[PDB]
Amino acid sequence: SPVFAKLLAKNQASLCNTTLNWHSQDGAGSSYLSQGLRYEEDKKELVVDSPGLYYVFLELKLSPTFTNTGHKVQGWVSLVLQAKPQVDDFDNLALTVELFPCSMENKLVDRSWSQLLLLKAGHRLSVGLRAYLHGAQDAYRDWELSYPNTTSFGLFLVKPDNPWE
Amino acid sequence: SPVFAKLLAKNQASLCNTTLNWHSQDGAGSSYLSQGLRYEEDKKELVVDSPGLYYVFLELKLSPTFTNTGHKVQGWVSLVLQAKPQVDDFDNLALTVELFPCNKLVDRSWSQLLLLKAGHRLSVGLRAYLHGAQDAYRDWELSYPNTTSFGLFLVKPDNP
Ligand SMILES: *[C@@H]1O[C@H](CO)[C@@H](O[C@@H]2O[C@H](CO)[C@@H](O[C@@H]3O[C@H](CO)[C@@H](O)[C@H](O[C@H]4O[C@H](CO)[C@@H](O)[C@H](O)[C@@H]4O)[C@@H]3O)[C@H](O)[C@H]2NC(C)=O)[C@H](O)[C@H]1NC(C)=O
Ligand SMILES: *[C@@H]1O[C@H](CO)[C@@H](O[C@@H]2O[C@H](CO)[C@@H](O[C@@H]3O[C@H](CO)[C@@H](O)[C@H](O)[C@@H]3O)[C@H](O)[C@H]2NC(C)=O)[C@H](O)[C@H]1NC(C)=O
Ligand code: NA
Ligand code: NA
Ligand code: NA
């Protein structure tokens, strides 16, 4: 069976610097994870069983709130992939959205990110929400992570490890 | 073995409405496709062998050119996934980048989980509407090494 996972972010009413919580199963027992992949609620980490080349993906869906007027609050919002252990290039493994007056709107922001990464057996992956917002009083209340525009995180095994290497 | 492909776009010196050409192997003879996948140069299509649920992805890398200056050129650039037969999801399977009068490399990704049939053909159309300056389409390009990509992975076979 293909090794694949697609987790959906638990709701976040406002933005802050925190590790995101994930739904690992839908409204029924059917999990968003295949075998060879586990999700740990306590650590908020996706645990990779076998080593290989994985296609890791992040999809940020920023929903504007009632207080959002679209053209005052600026800065940036990030989804930062937190890997244990660090991968050879795990330096700024992140999906960033820049908010500037130029291109700012009172509209849903839907951005995707991907990277092919060499992961080890027992590799732990968590996702941190990062944001610096300014321009109005209570700027972090102007955006949220909510269902049905759900932020997602996942991966799939592209090439299993070759031990000889 | 996993069913996976990651094709890299052939160079495009300026932006226009066309079906993109793709490299199916790198500089050496190393294939960008696994077994159960083919690329047809003539049709510019990725041919899917077995039916199932595929994670299809597009990644647009727009590189600014020498003539790319100021905050005048605006509009949009798109990568349109052209399926044969039409996938009964939406007729709007596209990556779209909006350009405002704002300049560096634009790197945007798109993905969708799609139910594909045996012999499914997938091609990618480049779409663009640029205005605000005389030869606005010359201000962006698709070039190596910041190469635009297209591929997929079989997530769930129909017949294990
Ligand atoms: C690639 O395909 C896309 C379609 O997917 C295509 O984009 C379309 O381009 C036309 C023009 O080339 C756009 O139409 C414009 O709409 C605005 C709306 O306000 C008008 O102001 C424009 O008209 C001006 O020019 C006229 C002279 O002909 C004057 O009569 C008028 O007063 C205006 O000054 C113009 O009609 C159209 O909106 C887009 N479509 C989309 C969906 O954005 C694109 O041009 C194709 N690219 C290439 C490289 O040819
Ligand atoms: C979440 O973490 C980020 C860091 O990743 C925090 O962003 C940082 O926030 C401070 C203000 O709180 C920014 O400093 C400001 O700089 C400007 C420079 O002109 C100055 O005018 C201000 O007086 C202030 O010192 C800092 O730039 C920013 N860092 C980055 C990298 O953008 C953020 O505050 C944290 N968020 C929460 C919710 O606390
Ligand atoms: Na959302
Ligand atoms: Na094509
Ligand atoms: Na490019």
From Swiss-Prot, chain B:
The keyword DNA repair does not apply. It is found in: Membrane. GO terms for biological process: immune response; myeloid dendritic cell differentiation; positive regulation of activated T cell proliferation; positive regulation of cytotoxic T cell differentiation; positive regulation of interleukin-12 production; positive regulation of interleukin-6 production; positive regulation of type II interferon production; regulation of immature T cell proliferation in thymus. One of its GO terms (cellular component) is extracellular space. Keywords: Cytokine, Glycoprotein, Membrane, Signal-anchor, Transmembrane, Transmembrane helix. Residues 1-160 are extracellular. It is a single-pass type II membrane protein. Glycans are attached at N17, N146. Disulfide bonds: none annotated. GO terms for molecular function: cytokine activity; signaling receptor binding; tumor necrosis factor receptor binding; tumor necrosis factor receptor superfamily binding. Its main location: membrane. Residues 3-155 form the THD domain. Cytokine that binds to TNFRSF9. Induces the proliferation of activated peripheral blood T-cells. May have a role in activation-induced cell death (AICD). May play a role in cognate interactions between T-cells and B-cells/macrophages. Homotrimer. Belongs to the tumor necrosis factor family. This is Tumor necrosis factor ligand superfamily member 9. It comes from Mus musculus. The chain holds residues 145 to 307 of 309 of the full protein.
